[PDB]
Amino acid sequence: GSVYLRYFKGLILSDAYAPGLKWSDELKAYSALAFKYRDVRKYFLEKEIEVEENVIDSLPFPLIKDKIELRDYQAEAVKAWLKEKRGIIVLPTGAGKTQVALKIVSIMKVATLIVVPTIDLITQWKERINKYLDFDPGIIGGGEDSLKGITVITYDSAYTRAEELGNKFPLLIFDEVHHLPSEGYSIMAQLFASPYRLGLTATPERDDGKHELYPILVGPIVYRKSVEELAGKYIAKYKIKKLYVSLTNEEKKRYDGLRKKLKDFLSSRGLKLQNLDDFHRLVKLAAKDKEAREALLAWHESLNIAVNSQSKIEKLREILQEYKNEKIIVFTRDTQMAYRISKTFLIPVVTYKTDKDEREEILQKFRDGEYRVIVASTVFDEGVDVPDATLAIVMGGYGTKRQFLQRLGRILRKKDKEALLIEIVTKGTADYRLS
Amino acid sequence: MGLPWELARFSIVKDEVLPHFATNEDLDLANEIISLFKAGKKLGEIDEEIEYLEKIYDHKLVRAFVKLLTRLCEFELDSPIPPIQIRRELFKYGPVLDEKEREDIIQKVSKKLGADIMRFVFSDLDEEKKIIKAPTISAEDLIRWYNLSLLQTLLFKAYKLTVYVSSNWKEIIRRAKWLGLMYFAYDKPLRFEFLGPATLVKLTEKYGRNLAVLLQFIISSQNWKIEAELVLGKKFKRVYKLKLANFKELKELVIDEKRFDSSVEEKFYKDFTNVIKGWKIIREPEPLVVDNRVFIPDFLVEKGNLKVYVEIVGFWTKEYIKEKLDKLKKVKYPILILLNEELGKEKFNGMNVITYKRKIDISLVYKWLRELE
DNA sequence: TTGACTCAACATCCTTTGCTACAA
DNA sequence: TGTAGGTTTCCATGTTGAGTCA
Ligand SMILES: [Cl-]
Ligand SMILES: [Cl-]
Ligand SMILES: [Cl-]
Ligand SMILES: [Cl-]
Ligand SMILES: [Cl-]
Ligand SMILES: [Cl-]
Ligand SMILES: [Cl-]
Ligand SMILES: [Cl-]
Ligand SMILES: [Cl-]
Ligand SMILES: [Mg+2]
Ligand SMILES: [Mg+2]
Ligand SMILES: [Mg+2]
Ligand SMILES: [Mg+2]
Ligand SMILES: [Mg+2]
Ligand SMILES: [Mg+2]
Ligand SMILES: [Mg+2]
Ligand SMILES: [Mg+2]
Ligand SMILES: [Mg+2]
Ligand SMILES: [Mg+2]
Ligand SMILES: [Mg+2]
Ligand SMILES: [Mg+2]
Ligand SMILES: [Mg+2]
Ligand SMILES: [Mg+2]
Ligand SMILES: [Mg+2]
C-alpha cells in the first residue's frame, strides 16, 4: 500500500512491484530506469494507494510572454500532443516546428530542456526564444555552460551530463528527433525522467531500423502533416525529375573489371550478399582476411566510379546552360566530386573540411545574392537554416535514406516560383534511388 | 601520447587482454614508412602511395605508422602567399561554362596578382600540405613508440592500475602525489592501486594523460609488474585484466622534467611554518600501516598530545573520498583532507575534509586545528 | 575569446531498370 | 527469434561537439 518513489543518478526506485522494475540489493528497493516514472506513477495513481512523488525537482520556471501567431495545423499539432503530453510531431523542414514547440512550452509553463544536435540549432533556438518568447535561455554546451530557466543543450552534453540533470526539466524537446535512437543518445533519453516529452522532426523514418523505440523513449507520432503534400501554405509544388547519364565507355571497362572481383569472390566462397541485409559479416571477414577487404574496397571504389562519374558533368553543363536566373544548389556524394565541380565550374564548396568562418561567409554571400550557384557535399541536410533556392541538383544519391532526400529536398522553402529538383544518376550502375 | 581506438590492435584469451605489439620482423615495413616521407612531399601523395602496402601488410599498423610520423613532421602551408583569397576573388566571376572563358578568367587572375594559381587553388587543407624537413628518426625508435602508444591506449580504458614496486618506493609515491593521481597504498605484496580514468564522470582526459606520464616514468626501472584491470566495450562493457612486466621494448625519451612542481605543497609548507610556532610539521612522516593497508599522509601536525595527519588531494570524486575516509577511520589520527574544486563540490564529513580553489588558506587550517584544540 | 589539432559517436554500407497508363 | 555457450564491433569516408595545449 504505502510506497515511496525516489530518484538517483538516472534511476527510479520504489517499494511496491510495478511492471517494468527489478529487485536490487545495493538499493534495497525495486529499481528501474527513470523514464518509467511517467508510467509507473500512472500505475500507482490508478491503484489508489496514495503514493507520494519526490522526483520532480523543477527549477523555478520564469514567467514568459507569448507572441506566437500560430497557424491552424500548428494548433492541431498542439492539441494532438496535449492529449497525453508524450509524442512526436512530423513536419517538413521549415514548417515552423520551432514555433510549435515554443507555443507548447508556453502553454505548459513548466521548466524545459531542449536537446539539439548541432551548435547551429543551439543558436537558432536561442534567437527564436529571444524573439518569440523574450527570454535568454540557459546555454549549456558549446561555448557556455549556463543553466537557467528554460535551457537548451547538445545531445552530447546531455549525455555526458545526464545524471547531473535527470531530476530536472519536467518537459523535454527533441528537434530533429531522428538523431535520438542512436547508441548513446538512447541511453541519454532513458536516464531522464521527464513525464512530458515532445520530439520534433521532418523525416522520422530511419533506414537503420531502430526507429521502433520511439514510444519507449518519447512516445508515438501523434500528428504528422502529410509529407510533401500540403503545398499551399508550405513550399511550392515539388517537381522532382531524374536525368539518366550514359556512363563513359572508357570508365565502363574498369567498372566491370572491378565488380568482377567482388562477384567472383562472393561466388567462390558462398556467403551471398545478394538480398542479404547483413553486410557486416563481410566486413568481419574483411578485418582479418586480405582478399576479403581487397574485394570489398574494390566494390567500394566501383560504387565511387558509379556515383562520381565524369560523364554526368556533361549534363551539368547542359543544365547550367538552361538555368541562368535561378538559385542553384548542387549536391554531391563525396568531397572528391565536390571539389572537382568547384575547379571545373568556379563554384564555392562547403564541406566539413572548409572552416567555420568561410562556411558562414559563403552562406552570407549566398543569401545576399552575390553567389548565385553553390556546391556542397551533403553537409546541408541538417537544420542549419541555410538560405533556400529554386533549382536543387542532386549528383550523389547517398543511398535511399529518407534523410538525404526528404530532409535534403526540403531546403527549398520559397513560393511563387518553379522550385524543381533534379537527380542526375547514371543508368548503368546502382542508382539506388529512394522508394 | 596515444593513438585512436580504431587502431588499437589486441586480442582476448580467456578474459585476459593481450596487446599485439610489433616484433623485429616488421622493421622492414617501418623502413619504407620513413622512406616514403620525403621533404617537400604532400600528404595526398603519401596516402595514395601507401594503399598498396595496406593490401599487403596490416592496415591498422600502416595507419599507426603514418599517423605518428605525420605527428612528428614539420608542415608548410603552401608556396602561394594568398592560400584562401584565391577562391575569394575567383569564384565571384559566376559559373564558367566554356573552356576559353575559363582560361581567360585564370589569365586575368594570374595578372591581378601573379602566380601559378592553376595548381595552388585549394591549399590550406590536409592533403595539400608539404614537408619543410624530413624528421630524423630510426625504425627501432618508431616501433618502440608505437608499442608504448598502444599500451597507453589500452590503459586509457582501465578501472584500476595496480603497480608492483621493485626497488624504488618513495620516488613513485612522490610522483603520484604531485601528479594528482588517486591511489590506495596496500602492503599485501606492497603495491599501489591507482584509480583508472573510468572512475571520472567527465574529467577523464587530463587524468589519463597524467597517469600516462607516471607510466612512462615507471617504464624506466628495474622491473615493473603492472596488473591493469581494463573496462572494454562500446555497446556493453566487460572487465578484463592486462598483466605485463619487464617489457624492455619501449621508448626511453623525454620525461617532461617539469610537469608539476608541487607549488601547492611548498606554498602550504612555507605558509604553515611561518604563521604559527605552536603546531609542528613533518616533511613526509613514515606511512602509517594498518592491517596491510598503507596510509601515506603528506604532513604530520602535532602539538603535545594532539597529532593529526593532513593530506592534500588532487583529482577526486565522491566515491574516492568516501572510501579513503572509511579506510582511514582506523588510523588513530584525526585525518585532515584538502580538496581541489575539480568535481561536484561536497561537504559531507566536514570534521575531516576542507576545500580550496587555487591555493591553501592557512586561516582555514588553523580554524580547523582550533576546532579540535 | 581565439585557433589549432585531435577523437568518440553516428552514418552509410544491400538485392537491378523492360508490356499500365496519370504528371501530384 | 529463445530452452545455451565464452568477446574487444568497425573493410571505408563523412560531421561535428567537446576537450585537450601552447
Ligand atoms: Cl490571445
Ligand atoms: Cl531579453
Ligand atoms: Cl510520417
Ligand atoms: Cl494518412
Ligand atoms: Cl577495434
Ligand atoms: Cl602473454
Ligand atoms: Cl600474425
Ligand atoms: Cl589559348
Ligand atoms: Cl606554543
Ligand atoms: Mg507584436
Ligand atoms: Mg507575419
Ligand atoms: Mg515525394
Ligand atoms: Mg557514352
Ligand atoms: Mg552479408
Ligand atoms: Mg569568427
Ligand atoms: Mg623477444
Ligand atoms: Mg640490422
Ligand atoms: Mg582565344
Ligand atoms: Mg640496427
Ligand atoms: Mg571518519
Ligand atoms: Mg580551478
Ligand atoms: Mg563525443
Ligand atoms: Mg555505427
Ligand atoms: Mg572548461
PDB file of N, CA, C and O in Angstrom, chain B residues 20-76:
ATOM      1  N   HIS B  20      48.688  -6.660 -29.165  1.00  0.00           N
ATOM      2  CA  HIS B  20      49.516  -7.086 -30.294  1.00  0.00           C
ATOM      3  C   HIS B  20      50.536  -5.996 -30.613  1.00  0.00           C
ATOM      4  O   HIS B  20      50.233  -5.030 -31.315  1.00  0.00           O
ATOM      5  N   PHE B  21      51.758  -6.161 -30.107  1.00  0.00           N
ATOM      6  CA  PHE B  21      52.843  -5.215 -30.348  1.00  0.00           C
ATOM      7  C   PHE B  21      53.504  -5.467 -31.705  1.00  0.00           C
ATOM      8  O   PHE B  21      52.955  -6.192 -32.546  1.00  0.00           O
ATOM      9  N   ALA B  22      54.675  -4.870 -31.939  1.00  0.00           N
ATOM     10  CA  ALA B  22      55.407  -5.023 -33.193  1.00  0.00           C
ATOM     11  C   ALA B  22      56.775  -5.633 -32.916  1.00  0.00           C
ATOM     12  O   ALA B  22      57.592  -5.035 -32.208  1.00  0.00           O
ATOM     13  N   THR B  23      57.016  -6.821 -33.467  1.00  0.00           N
ATOM     14  CA  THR B  23      58.288  -7.519 -33.320  1.00  0.00           C
ATOM     15  C   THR B  23      59.335  -6.908 -34.253  1.00  0.00           C
ATOM     16  O   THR B  23      59.112  -5.877 -34.894  1.00  0.00           O
ATOM     17  N   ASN B  24      60.507  -7.547 -34.333  1.00  0.00           N
ATOM     18  CA  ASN B  24      61.561  -7.063 -35.217  1.00  0.00           C
ATOM     19  C   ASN B  24      61.298  -7.400 -36.680  1.00  0.00           C
ATOM     20  O   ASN B  24      61.726  -6.654 -37.570  1.00  0.00           O
ATOM     21  N   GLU B  25      60.573  -8.488 -36.950  1.00  0.00           N
ATOM     22  CA  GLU B  25      60.293  -8.887 -38.326  1.00  0.00           C
ATOM     23  C   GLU B  25      59.589  -7.804 -39.131  1.00  0.00           C
ATOM     24  O   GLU B  25      59.565  -7.893 -40.364  1.00  0.00           O
ATOM     25  N   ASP B  26      59.021  -6.796 -38.474  1.00  0.00           N
ATOM     26  CA  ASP B  26      58.274  -5.748 -39.146  1.00  0.00           C
ATOM     27  C   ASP B  26      59.108  -4.512 -39.455  1.00  0.00           C
ATOM     28  O   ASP B  26      58.615  -3.620 -40.159  1.00  0.00           O
ATOM     29  N   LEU B  27      60.342  -4.430 -38.934  1.00  0.00           N
ATOM     30  CA  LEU B  27      61.195  -3.269 -39.191  1.00  0.00           C
ATOM     31  C   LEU B  27      61.190  -2.869 -40.661  1.00  0.00           C
ATOM     32  O   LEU B  27      61.124  -1.677 -40.985  1.00  0.00           O
ATOM     33  N   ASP B  28      61.244  -3.856 -41.562  1.00  0.00           N
ATOM     34  CA  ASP B  28      61.228  -3.588 -42.997  1.00  0.00           C
ATOM     35  C   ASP B  28      60.115  -2.612 -43.357  1.00  0.00           C
ATOM     36  O   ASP B  28      60.367  -1.540 -43.922  1.00  0.00           O
ATOM     37  N   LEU B  29      58.873  -2.967 -43.011  1.00  0.00           N
ATOM     38  CA  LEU B  29      57.746  -2.062 -43.213  1.00  0.00           C
ATOM     39  C   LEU B  29      58.064  -0.666 -42.699  1.00  0.00           C
ATOM     40  O   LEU B  29      58.011   0.313 -43.453  1.00  0.00           O
ATOM     41  N   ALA B  30      58.440  -0.571 -41.418  1.00  0.00           N
ATOM     42  CA  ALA B  30      58.757   0.723 -40.823  1.00  0.00           C
ATOM     43  C   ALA B  30      59.741   1.495 -41.683  1.00  0.00           C
ATOM     44  O   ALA B  30      59.553   2.695 -41.929  1.00  0.00           O
ATOM     45  N   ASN B  31      60.769   0.811 -42.191  1.00  0.00           N
ATOM     46  CA  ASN B  31      61.761   1.464 -43.038  1.00  0.00           C
ATOM     47  C   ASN B  31      61.085   2.215 -44.177  1.00  0.00           C
ATOM     48  O   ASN B  31      61.269   3.429 -44.336  1.00  0.00           O
ATOM     49  N   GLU B  32      60.254   1.511 -44.955  1.00  0.00           N
ATOM     50  CA  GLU B  32      59.579   2.162 -46.074  1.00  0.00           C
ATOM     51  C   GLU B  32      58.721   3.322 -45.594  1.00  0.00           C
ATOM     52  O   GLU B  32      58.668   4.373 -46.243  1.00  0.00           O
ATOM     53  N   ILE B  33      58.068   3.163 -44.439  1.00  0.00           N
ATOM     54  CA  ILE B  33      57.193   4.220 -43.950  1.00  0.00           C
ATOM     55  C   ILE B  33      57.993   5.483 -43.674  1.00  0.00           C
ATOM     56  O   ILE B  33      57.480   6.598 -43.828  1.00  0.00           O
ATOM     57  N   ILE B  34      59.260   5.341 -43.287  1.00  0.00           N
ATOM     58  CA  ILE B  34      60.079   6.537 -43.153  1.00  0.00           C
ATOM     59  C   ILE B  34      60.641   6.958 -44.507  1.00  0.00           C
ATOM     60  O   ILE B  34      60.785   8.157 -44.776  1.00  0.00           O
ATOM     61  N   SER B  35      60.945   6.000 -45.387  1.00  0.00           N
ATOM     62  CA  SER B  35      61.469   6.344 -46.703  1.00  0.00           C
ATOM     63  C   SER B  35      60.402   6.886 -47.642  1.00  0.00           C
ATOM     64  O   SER B  35      60.747   7.402 -48.710  1.00  0.00           O
ATOM     65  N   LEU B  36      59.125   6.801 -47.273  1.00  0.00           N
ATOM     66  CA  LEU B  36      58.096   7.393 -48.113  1.00  0.00           C
ATOM     67  C   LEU B  36      57.977   8.887 -47.839  1.00  0.00           C
ATOM     68  O   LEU B  36      57.675   9.660 -48.755  1.00  0.00           O
ATOM     69  N   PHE B  37      58.244   9.312 -46.605  1.00  0.00           N
ATOM     70  CA  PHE B  37      58.087  10.711 -46.210  1.00  0.00           C
ATOM     71  C   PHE B  37      59.368  11.433 -46.600  1.00  0.00           C
ATOM     72  O   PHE B  37      60.365  11.415 -45.874  1.00  0.00           O
ATOM     73  N   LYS B  38      59.349  12.063 -47.767  1.00  0.00           N
ATOM     74  CA  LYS B  38      60.450  12.897 -48.223  1.00  0.00           C
ATOM     75  C   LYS B  38      60.129  14.367 -47.982  1.00  0.00           C
ATOM     76  O   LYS B  38      58.970  14.758 -47.820  1.00  0.00           O
ATOM     77  N   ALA B  39      61.179  15.181 -47.940  1.00  0.00           N
ATOM     78  CA  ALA B  39      60.994  16.616 -47.794  1.00  0.00           C
ATOM     79  C   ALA B  39      60.295  17.176 -49.027  1.00  0.00           C
ATOM     80  O   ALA B  39      60.609  16.807 -50.161  1.00  0.00           O
ATOM     81  N   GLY B  40      59.339  18.070 -48.798  1.00  0.00           N
ATOM     82  CA  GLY B  40      58.599  18.669 -49.892  1.00  0.00           C
ATOM     83  C   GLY B  40      57.615  17.732 -50.555  1.00  0.00           C
ATOM     84  O   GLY B  40      57.375  17.853 -51.762  1.00  0.00           O
ATOM     85  N   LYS B  41      57.034  16.802 -49.798  1.00  0.00           N
ATOM     86  CA  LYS B  41      56.056  15.855 -50.312  1.00  0.00           C
ATOM     87  C   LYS B  41      54.718  16.090 -49.628  1.00  0.00           C
ATOM     88  O   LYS B  41      54.668  16.418 -48.439  1.00  0.00           O
ATOM     89  N   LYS B  42      53.636  15.927 -50.384  1.00  0.00           N
ATOM     90  CA  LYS B  42      52.295  16.191 -49.883  1.00  0.00           C
ATOM     91  C   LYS B  42      51.644  14.929 -49.324  1.00  0.00           C
ATOM     92  O   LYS B  42      51.942  13.811 -49.752  1.00  0.00           O
ATOM     93  N   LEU B  43      50.736  15.128 -48.362  1.00  0.00           N
ATOM     94  CA  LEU B  43      50.102  14.002 -47.676  1.00  0.00           C
ATOM     95  C   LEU B  43      49.237  13.165 -48.614  1.00  0.00           C
ATOM     96  O   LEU B  43      49.116  11.952 -48.419  1.00  0.00           O
ATOM     97  N   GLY B  44      48.623  13.792 -49.621  1.00  0.00           N
ATOM     98  CA  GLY B  44      47.869  13.032 -50.607  1.00  0.00           C
ATOM     99  C   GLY B  44      48.732  12.038 -51.356  1.00  0.00           C
ATOM    100  O   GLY B  44      48.363  10.871 -51.515  1.00  0.00           O
ATOM    101  N   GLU B  45      49.893  12.492 -51.830  1.00  0.00           N
ATOM    102  CA  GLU B  45      50.832  11.586 -52.480  1.00  0.00           C
ATOM    103  C   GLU B  45      51.224  10.443 -51.545  1.00  0.00           C
ATOM    104  O   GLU B  45      51.322   9.288 -51.969  1.00  0.00           O
ATOM    105  N   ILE B  46      51.294  10.725 -50.245  1.00  0.00           N
ATOM    106  CA  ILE B  46      51.680   9.712 -49.268  1.00  0.00           C
ATOM    107  C   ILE B  46      50.588   8.656 -49.137  1.00  0.00           C
ATOM    108  O   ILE B  46      50.821   7.471 -49.391  1.00  0.00           O
ATOM    109  N   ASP B  47      49.393   9.060 -48.702  1.00  0.00           N
ATOM    110  CA  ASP B  47      48.320   8.085 -48.524  1.00  0.00           C
ATOM    111  C   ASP B  47      47.983   7.356 -49.822  1.00  0.00           C
ATOM    112  O   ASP B  47      47.669   6.160 -49.799  1.00  0.00           O
ATOM    113  N   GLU B  48      48.016   8.051 -50.961  1.00  0.00           N
ATOM    114  CA  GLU B  48      47.716   7.368 -52.211  1.00  0.00           C
ATOM    115  C   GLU B  48      48.774   6.321 -52.532  1.00  0.00           C
ATOM    116  O   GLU B  48      48.457   5.280 -53.123  1.00  0.00           O
ATOM    117  N   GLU B  49      50.022   6.569 -52.143  1.00  0.00           N
ATOM    118  CA  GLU B  49      51.087   5.638 -52.462  1.00  0.00           C
ATOM    119  C   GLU B  49      51.211   4.498 -51.452  1.00  0.00           C
ATOM    120  O   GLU B  49      51.945   3.534 -51.712  1.00  0.00           O
ATOM    121  N   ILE B  50      50.529   4.578 -50.308  1.00  0.00           N
ATOM    122  CA  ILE B  50      50.577   3.518 -49.310  1.00  0.00           C
ATOM    123  C   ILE B  50      49.319   2.658 -49.331  1.00  0.00           C
ATOM    124  O   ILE B  50      49.166   1.779 -48.481  1.00  0.00           O
ATOM    125  N   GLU B  51      48.409   2.888 -50.283  1.00  0.00           N
ATOM    126  CA  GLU B  51      47.296   1.959 -50.454  1.00  0.00           C
ATOM    127  C   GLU B  51      47.810   0.575 -50.857  1.00  0.00           C
ATOM    128  O   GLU B  51      47.175  -0.443 -50.554  1.00  0.00           O
ATOM    129  N   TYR B  52      48.965   0.511 -51.543  1.00  0.00           N
ATOM    130  CA  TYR B  52      49.492  -0.786 -51.960  1.00  0.00           C
ATOM    131  C   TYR B  52      50.039  -1.565 -50.760  1.00  0.00           C
ATOM    132  O   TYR B  52      49.907  -2.793 -50.697  1.00  0.00           O
ATOM    133  N   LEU B  53      50.673  -0.870 -49.802  1.00  0.00           N
ATOM    134  CA  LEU B  53      51.126  -1.522 -48.573  1.00  0.00           C
ATOM    135  C   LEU B  53      49.969  -2.028 -47.717  1.00  0.00           C
ATOM    136  O   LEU B  53      50.073  -3.102 -47.111  1.00  0.00           O
ATOM    137  N   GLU B  54      48.853  -1.290 -47.659  1.00  0.00           N
ATOM    138  CA  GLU B  54      47.714  -1.758 -46.867  1.00  0.00           C
ATOM    139  C   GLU B  54      47.109  -3.044 -47.408  1.00  0.00           C
ATOM    140  O   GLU B  54      46.477  -3.787 -46.647  1.00  0.00           O
ATOM    141  N   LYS B  55      47.293  -3.322 -48.695  1.00  0.00           N
ATOM    142  CA  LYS B  55      46.827  -4.571 -49.270  1.00  0.00           C
ATOM    143  C   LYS B  55      47.755  -5.722 -48.920  1.00  0.00           C
ATOM    144  O   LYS B  55      47.344  -6.886 -49.001  1.00  0.00           O
ATOM    145  N   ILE B  56      48.986  -5.415 -48.524  1.00  0.00           N
ATOM    146  CA  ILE B  56      49.998  -6.415 -48.224  1.00  0.00           C
ATOM    147  C   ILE B  56      50.160  -6.624 -46.721  1.00  0.00           C
ATOM    148  O   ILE B  56      50.109  -7.752 -46.233  1.00  0.00           O
ATOM    149  N   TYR B  57      50.349  -5.543 -45.967  1.00  0.00           N
ATOM    150  CA  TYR B  57      50.565  -5.619 -44.532  1.00  0.00           C
ATOM    151  C   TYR B  57      49.286  -5.236 -43.791  1.00  0.00           C
ATOM    152  O   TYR B  57      48.267  -4.888 -44.392  1.00  0.00           O
ATOM    153  N   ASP B  58      49.345  -5.301 -42.463  1.00  0.00           N
ATOM    154  CA  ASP B  58      48.190  -4.965 -41.641  1.00  0.00           C
ATOM    155  C   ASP B  58      47.897  -3.472 -41.758  1.00  0.00           C
ATOM    156  O   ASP B  58      48.754  -2.636 -41.454  1.00  0.00           O
ATOM    157  N   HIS B  59      46.684  -3.146 -42.211  1.00  0.00           N
ATOM    158  CA  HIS B  59      46.327  -1.755 -42.478  1.00  0.00           C
ATOM    159  C   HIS B  59      46.347  -0.913 -41.205  1.00  0.00           C
ATOM    160  O   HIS B  59      46.719   0.266 -41.241  1.00  0.00           O
ATOM    161  N   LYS B  60      45.924  -1.486 -40.076  1.00  0.00           N
ATOM    162  CA  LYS B  60      45.900  -0.716 -38.837  1.00  0.00           C
ATOM    163  C   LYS B  60      47.310  -0.290 -38.439  1.00  0.00           C
ATOM    164  O   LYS B  60      47.525   0.851 -38.013  1.00  0.00           O
ATOM    165  N   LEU B  61      48.295  -1.175 -38.636  1.00  0.00           N
ATOM    166  CA  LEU B  61      49.683  -0.842 -38.319  1.00  0.00           C
ATOM    167  C   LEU B  61      50.230   0.225 -39.261  1.00  0.00           C
ATOM    168  O   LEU B  61      50.960   1.128 -38.832  1.00  0.00           O
ATOM    169  N   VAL B  62      49.905   0.129 -40.551  1.00  0.00           N
ATOM    170  CA  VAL B  62      50.368   1.133 -41.506  1.00  0.00           C
ATOM    171  C   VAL B  62      49.786   2.496 -41.158  1.00  0.00           C
ATOM    172  O   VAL B  62      50.490   3.515 -41.194  1.00  0.00           O
ATOM    173  N   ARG B  63      48.493   2.542 -40.820  1.00  0.00           N
ATOM    174  CA  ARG B  63      47.900   3.800 -40.378  1.00  0.00           C
ATOM    175  C   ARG B  63      48.582   4.324 -39.127  1.00  0.00           C
ATOM    176  O   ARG B  63      48.810   5.528 -39.005  1.00  0.00           O
ATOM    177  N   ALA B  64      48.890   3.446 -38.170  1.00  0.00           N
ATOM    178  CA  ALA B  64      49.565   3.896 -36.956  1.00  0.00           C
ATOM    179  C   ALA B  64      50.906   4.540 -37.286  1.00  0.00           C
ATOM    180  O   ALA B  64      51.229   5.631 -36.794  1.00  0.00           O
ATOM    181  N   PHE B  65      51.688   3.886 -38.148  1.00  0.00           N
ATOM    182  CA  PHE B  65      52.985   4.428 -38.544  1.00  0.00           C
ATOM    183  C   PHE B  65      52.839   5.794 -39.208  1.00  0.00           C
ATOM    184  O   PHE B  65      53.527   6.755 -38.839  1.00  0.00           O
ATOM    185  N   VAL B  66      51.952   5.897 -40.204  1.00  0.00           N
ATOM    186  CA  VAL B  66      51.841   7.155 -40.938  1.00  0.00           C
ATOM    187  C   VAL B  66      51.280   8.250 -40.039  1.00  0.00           C
ATOM    188  O   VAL B  66      51.712   9.405 -40.108  1.00  0.00           O
ATOM    189  N   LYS B  67      50.362   7.901 -39.137  1.00  0.00           N
ATOM    190  CA  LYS B  67      49.782   8.890 -38.239  1.00  0.00           C
ATOM    191  C   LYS B  67      50.847   9.461 -37.308  1.00  0.00           C
ATOM    192  O   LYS B  67      50.970  10.685 -37.163  1.00  0.00           O
ATOM    193  N   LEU B  68      51.650   8.588 -36.692  1.00  0.00           N
ATOM    194  CA  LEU B  68      52.710   9.062 -35.805  1.00  0.00           C
ATOM    195  C   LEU B  68      53.722   9.915 -36.560  1.00  0.00           C
ATOM    196  O   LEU B  68      54.083  11.017 -36.119  1.00  0.00           O
ATOM    197  N   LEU B  69      54.196   9.420 -37.708  1.00  0.00           N
ATOM    198  CA  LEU B  69      55.236  10.143 -38.428  1.00  0.00           C
ATOM    199  C   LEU B  69      54.734  11.491 -38.937  1.00  0.00           C
ATOM    200  O   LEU B  69      55.503  12.456 -38.968  1.00  0.00           O
ATOM    201  N   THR B  70      53.448  11.598 -39.296  1.00  0.00           N
ATOM    202  CA  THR B  70      52.894  12.916 -39.598  1.00  0.00           C
ATOM    203  C   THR B  70      52.804  13.783 -38.348  1.00  0.00           C
ATOM    204  O   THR B  70      52.950  15.008 -38.436  1.00  0.00           O
ATOM    205  N   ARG B  71      52.571  13.174 -37.180  1.00  0.00           N
ATOM    206  CA  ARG B  71      52.625  13.943 -35.940  1.00  0.00           C
ATOM    207  C   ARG B  71      54.027  14.476 -35.661  1.00  0.00           C
ATOM    208  O   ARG B  71      54.169  15.472 -34.941  1.00  0.00           O
ATOM    209  N   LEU B  72      55.069  13.835 -36.203  1.00  0.00           N
ATOM    210  CA  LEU B  72      56.436  14.317 -35.993  1.00  0.00           C
ATOM    211  C   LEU B  72      56.913  15.339 -37.022  1.00  0.00           C
ATOM    212  O   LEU B  72      57.816  16.122 -36.709  1.00  0.00           O
ATOM    213  N   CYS B  73      56.344  15.361 -38.225  1.00  0.00           N
ATOM    214  CA  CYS B  73      56.898  16.193 -39.285  1.00  0.00           C
ATOM    215  C   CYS B  73      56.618  17.678 -39.043  1.00  0.00           C
ATOM    216  O   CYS B  73      55.842  18.066 -38.165  1.00  0.00           O
ATOM    217  N   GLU B  74      57.293  18.511 -39.835  1.00  0.00           N
ATOM    218  CA  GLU B  74      57.077  19.954 -39.880  1.00  0.00           C
ATOM    219  C   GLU B  74      56.462  20.300 -41.229  1.00  0.00           C
ATOM    220  O   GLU B  74      57.099  20.114 -42.272  1.00  0.00           O
ATOM    221  N   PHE B  75      55.234  20.809 -41.207  1.00  0.00           N
ATOM    222  CA  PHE B  75      54.465  21.052 -42.417  1.00  0.00           C
ATOM    223  C   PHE B  75      54.520  22.512 -42.847  1.00  0.00           C
ATOM    224  O   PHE B  75      54.659  23.422 -42.025  1.00  0.00           O
ATOM    225  N   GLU B  76      54.408  22.720 -44.158  1.00  0.00           N
ATOM    226  CA  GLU B  76      54.288  24.036 -44.767  1.00  0.00           C
ATOM    227  C   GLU B  76      52.855  24.256 -45.237  1.00  0.00           C
ATOM    228  O   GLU B  76      52.191  23.315 -45.684  1.00  0.00           O
TER     229      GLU B  76
END
